[PDB]
Amino acid sequence: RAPSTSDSVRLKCREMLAAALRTGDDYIAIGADEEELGSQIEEAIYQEIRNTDMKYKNRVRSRISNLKDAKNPNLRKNVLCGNIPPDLFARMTAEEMASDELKEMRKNLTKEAIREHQMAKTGGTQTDLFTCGKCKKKNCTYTQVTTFVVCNECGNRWKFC
Amino acid sequence: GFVGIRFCQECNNMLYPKEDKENRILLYACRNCDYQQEADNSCIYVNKITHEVDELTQIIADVSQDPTLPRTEDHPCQKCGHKEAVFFQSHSARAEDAMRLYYVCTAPHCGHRWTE
Amino acid sequence: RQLHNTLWGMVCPAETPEGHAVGLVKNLALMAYISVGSQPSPILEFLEEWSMENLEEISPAAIADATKIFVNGCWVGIHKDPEQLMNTLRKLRRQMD
Amino acid sequence: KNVTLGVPRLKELINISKKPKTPSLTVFLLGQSARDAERAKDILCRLEHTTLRKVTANTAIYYDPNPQSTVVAEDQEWVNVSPWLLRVELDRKHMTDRKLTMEQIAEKINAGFGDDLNCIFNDDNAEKLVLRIRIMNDDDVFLRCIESNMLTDMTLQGIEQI
Amino acid sequence: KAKQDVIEVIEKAHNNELEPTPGNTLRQTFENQVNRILNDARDKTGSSAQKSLSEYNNFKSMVVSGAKGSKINISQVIAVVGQQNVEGKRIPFGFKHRTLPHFIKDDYGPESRGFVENSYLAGLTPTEFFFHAMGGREGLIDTAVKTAE
Amino acid sequence: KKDSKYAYTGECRSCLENSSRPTSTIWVSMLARIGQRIVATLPYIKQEVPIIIVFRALGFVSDRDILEHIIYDFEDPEMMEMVKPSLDEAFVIQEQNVALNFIGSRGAKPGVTKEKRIKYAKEVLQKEMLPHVGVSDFCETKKAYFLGYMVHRLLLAALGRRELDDRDHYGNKRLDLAGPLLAF
Ligand SMILES: [Zn+2]
Ligand SMILES: [Zn+2]
């Protein structure tokens, strides 16, 4: 049970969180105490911040927006059903609270960006007919133009005329 | 949306914006004249960082009658449904990264353009 | 110094010095010919006769849907039918009149 | 990519210049990031200079008299609660690629210009990554100047030069 | 085969299927792929020409002895000259979006950008002859500036 | 040109016809960086002048007329935003006399008095810049149209809607044979 708070700001934040959780009526369907969940979330937020300063108000506003985001009521339902403990929701980040589709899209974009940041490997005809003298390995790639040799694993560089 | 210049009525000059502190509204004044007019667009300045410009708005129908422009039949027009058509790249500097074509129908009185 | 693409059939792409002046000295192609010069007045009159609004008296709003005619770099007059004007000009030059 | 070897590089090395032609570093990762690209992408992002211009898409200024009026249709101000504001909407693909969050962006934008503005960021669930920059306490051009100078250089995440 | 492959690459680029290779823009990756295809074709042709020589051939004798020449010289003489690059890139568009008046606009094809498909034994088409001239001129300019510096 | 403060430069070598005076050059450039402030380099003027002042000096008080000469269509606000900076820059020049005074003040031989500066400005604006269009008593209209055309081309180049002109394209070159060489 979240301890009661005599702070007007804390009470207002708890009421706002309870109202946000009541959006969608999922509280009735899950039989969850919306007021209790809101109080627990507010207590967790206060403990994390320890002050009802701009950081705490911003965190409360972000949490309320996440809960009332009708584009992903799955998170709200999970919170009302206990899937996300109030401490986890308080400590959860925007990426964590993102809906399933948004999370998948973000992951795909991040992977695409990571791939695009890379550098294209140097081309060549990989072969094991040449022995690298710097590592003793047989894997390497050759380029004809004088036949330049690039070690595969060791990376020995040499040319043959 | 964008914003287009609106000139004065008497002096015919550039009209700057002004926020009416009294009636709390948006007005356009003249530097020289004292002409005022109540604004309607409720926007002042917009910047397009991506510069998403539609090349079709720049293409013109006259390009069709060009003797040094390729022609194909596999992309018939839509409106007139003609067979012959021309195609070319953006032909515009600062092309970010694209060679997407812009087909233009080859027939008088049609001037149709499209992209695939 | 680099041999530009436009020098096709005007300047020999092979003949040139190989010292410090490589690429600067150039030779005309066998078929190359240089215009000696003429006068614009006959062309100005010929264009004036056609339905070519003169630049001095023309609604500015009418420049958009039109074509600007430059002669020797003088923006003079404006036409509303480039496709026919160019054809008439080409035929006239072909006949040499 | 470009290294400019040969006579130009020799000349640069001989003539110690304050600005070479192709300056560059070869940073070697140390931790586990040296193996998996996943934990090196973040390092690269944090070493690469990022600015509003790299994450922004459009920037429209509006003279919205009443904040709750919200001439534009966005249900983010009423929840959160000068007759003008800047709606600096951000790109998603770029922001994801650099892996930033509106929280840090807002903190940085507020701190850099002091407690003179109030950036009402937006939740990371809405499709549009809108923002709202307002000034509280010539004023028209002040927004233009501030937006110009911040867009030109803000250093959201990374160092300069790079 | 090389021509067909470059045509397919151009088709994919035109229809927006060629995804940008990492670290490069779409045009850059398109150019890189085309150059790799042409270089591979030239190498394959040169290898085929080399393997097709006879011990009594004199080019091969001089090259193997290393006195004067190289395998690339033989490949150009017999198999195919190859790409005629300038400033480390393919022939530019001197005219409006095209190399020479003969070719049509937006013709990135191999021969329309410099690819000398013939060989020095079978003569050269005029367009590729001009492009070869441009390559030689670039070489001479580089020689002069190097000697000066 | 990048090795300078101007992002673009609208060069134009004017020469009427083998005239006694040498060819005059008009550079209509734009500052790179407000931003996007257009300038000009008239002959015999050491400093630069904003284009709007020049247009007003040519006898165009109204702003709408200046824009019409410069921009041909008002339906593309994307282009208008590029000229608004330079337009608002010179907001303290409306009458023609003040414009002439401003132009003449930068002259190489600044008239000790106001009338001399005005006369010098008028002469330089009617005989030194763009001679080829016309140097008669009443040719200000065509000169203004040509200047607006140059500005329009510069704006088109800046927007990238039209690639820049190559410097080595022989289409932009002419050959001086024995004739012109001896005539000089
Ligand atoms: Zn007015
Ligand atoms: Zn059609």
Short mmCIF file of C-alpha atoms in Angstrom, two decimals, chain F residues 19-102:
data_model
loop_
_atom_site.label_atom_id
_atom_site.label_comp_id
_atom_site.label_asym_id
_atom_site.label_seq_id
_atom_site.Cartn_x
_atom_site.Cartn_y
_atom_site.Cartn_z
CA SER F 19 32.59 50.10 -78.29
CA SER F 20 35.29 52.53 -77.21
CA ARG F 21 34.74 51.63 -73.56
CA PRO F 22 35.95 48.21 -72.39
CA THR F 23 33.56 45.47 -71.37
CA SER F 24 31.91 46.04 -67.99
CA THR F 25 31.37 43.24 -65.48
CA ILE F 26 28.35 42.91 -63.21
CA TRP F 27 28.64 40.47 -60.31
CA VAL F 28 25.32 39.82 -58.61
CA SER F 29 26.42 37.67 -55.67
CA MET F 30 24.76 36.46 -52.48
CA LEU F 31 26.16 36.33 -48.96
CA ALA F 32 26.42 32.83 -47.54
CA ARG F 33 25.97 33.32 -43.77
CA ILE F 34 19.16 36.87 -41.17
CA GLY F 35 21.03 35.25 -44.04
CA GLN F 36 20.63 35.24 -47.81
CA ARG F 37 21.34 38.92 -48.39
CA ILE F 38 21.94 39.63 -52.07
CA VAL F 39 24.56 42.13 -53.21
CA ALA F 40 25.93 43.58 -56.44
CA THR F 41 29.26 44.90 -57.72
CA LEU F 42 28.62 47.74 -60.12
CA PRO F 43 31.52 49.21 -62.10
CA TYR F 44 33.41 52.13 -60.54
CA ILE F 45 31.90 51.29 -57.13
CA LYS F 46 34.41 49.93 -54.64
CA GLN F 47 31.76 48.81 -52.16
CA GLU F 48 28.79 46.54 -52.80
CA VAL F 49 25.16 47.61 -52.99
CA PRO F 50 21.99 45.63 -52.17
CA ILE F 51 19.99 44.87 -55.28
CA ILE F 52 16.84 46.52 -53.96
CA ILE F 53 18.55 49.90 -53.68
CA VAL F 54 19.76 49.56 -57.26
CA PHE F 55 16.25 48.78 -58.49
CA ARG F 56 14.85 51.78 -56.64
CA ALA F 57 17.60 53.95 -58.11
CA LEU F 58 16.47 52.78 -61.55
CA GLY F 59 13.09 54.36 -60.82
CA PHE F 60 11.03 51.66 -59.08
CA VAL F 61 9.64 52.99 -55.82
CA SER F 62 6.90 50.38 -55.52
CA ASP F 63 7.96 47.08 -53.99
CA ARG F 64 5.48 45.04 -56.02
CA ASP F 65 7.01 46.29 -59.28
CA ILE F 66 10.51 45.34 -58.14
CA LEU F 67 9.38 41.85 -57.20
CA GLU F 68 7.53 41.47 -60.50
CA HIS F 69 10.67 42.34 -62.43
CA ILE F 70 12.73 39.94 -60.32
CA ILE F 71 10.30 37.07 -59.73
CA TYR F 72 7.87 36.21 -62.51
CA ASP F 73 5.39 34.10 -60.52
CA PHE F 74 4.06 34.84 -57.04
CA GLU F 75 2.40 31.43 -56.61
CA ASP F 76 5.58 29.73 -55.39
CA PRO F 77 6.18 31.23 -51.93
CA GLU F 78 9.20 28.94 -51.63
CA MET F 79 11.07 31.42 -53.82
CA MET F 80 9.68 34.51 -52.10
CA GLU F 81 11.22 33.43 -48.79
CA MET F 82 14.65 33.73 -50.41
CA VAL F 83 14.21 37.40 -51.34
CA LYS F 84 12.37 38.55 -48.20
CA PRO F 85 15.66 38.90 -46.26
CA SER F 86 17.40 41.06 -48.82
CA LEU F 87 14.13 42.89 -49.47
CA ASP F 88 13.57 43.87 -45.83
CA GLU F 89 17.26 44.68 -45.49
CA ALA F 90 16.95 47.93 -47.45
CA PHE F 91 13.76 49.28 -45.88
CA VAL F 92 15.05 52.85 -45.40
CA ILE F 93 15.26 53.66 -49.13
CA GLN F 94 11.99 54.55 -50.84
CA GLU F 95 12.52 57.71 -52.88
CA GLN F 96 14.83 57.67 -55.88
CA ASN F 97 16.97 60.62 -54.78
CA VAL F 98 18.14 58.90 -51.60
CA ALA F 99 18.90 55.74 -53.56
CA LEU F 100 21.04 57.72 -55.99
CA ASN F 101 22.84 59.44 -53.12
CA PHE F 102 23.55 56.08 -51.51
#
